[PDB]
Amino acid sequence: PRVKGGTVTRKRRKKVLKLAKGYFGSKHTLYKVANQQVMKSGNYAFRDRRQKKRDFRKLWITRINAAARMNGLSYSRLMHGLKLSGIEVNRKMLADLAVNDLTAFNQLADAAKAQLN
Template sequence: MVKINFVNARHKRRKKVLKLAKGYFGSKSTLYKTANEQVMRSLQYAYRDRRQKKRNFRKLWITRINAGCVNNNISYSRFIHGLLLAQVEVNRKILADMAYQEPDMFASYVELAKEHLSKKELILAQQKAELTKQKEQEEKAQLEKTNKLKQVKKAEAELAQQKEQEEKDQLELNQNQTVESTVELTEEAPEEIKVVQEEIKVKTNEEIDLNKMLVADLKKLAKKYNIENFSKMKKADLIESLEKFINKN
């Protein structure tokens, strides 16, 4: 069978496009191919220009509202903000017509916006004052806290200094007492006691110096004290025997 390309749906589609292309110049309105191209472009232009027209009208409305606001001593942004605070749901198109055709009604809307703006400013001023007051109180409390800490640290430092001075005085007092007692003993003691004290001092010096002495010196000392077999002893044995001898005597 022969294939039929020009079916009913295709015929309707072409007819619709040619209907949209009516009035176009030349083949753009008669031939489907060129007409379809032009219709697609025209639809794109229409889509773009509808949005541009909205922008232009919005610009016109804002210009008219701004002119009405200038006559009533208020800026456009403050007027719109005041209407938002008053919860007035009137769009810019109606406000522009009102400013252009009914200035008295527009002035009443301006007064309403000003009233709500003044209320908002008063609330903001109160909040700001409360915040500053709270901040000042916090700063004052912080300052008092730091002052208290400084006073506590100062008191602790003074107490530690006083304690240190007392310990120092007590130490000096003890030293003075020991010096006085030794002076009294040396003045009052007989010559025999002084000799014994000197011997004790010598012994203590020997005890202290034994570890520092050489082996030859230790042997000489052992010979002096008549220690047996000192020549065969090592240093540790010499020191031990000398210490025993000193402790006995």
């Protein structure tokens, strides 16, 4: 027997066009360009889910460097001292919080200073 088919095509294209909501101009209207943009977005999302982990560490290092130079050390010397004291278990992220929310963390910088002698 014969099979026509219109419903499956309409639904499958509408799903993509709904995923392309918010794009500029023709890229939320026409199926052919919306499909391309959705594929590009998938690739970008994967790549940037890796780059996010890359970037937050960079931010943390910058803030630690600033708060450490507020004490007479540099980032490298402070990290070496912290590791040399076993207290280094403390992260970079948690360190950075204890730099915008409790600069009384200088205690840690004092410990690193004591160990660096």
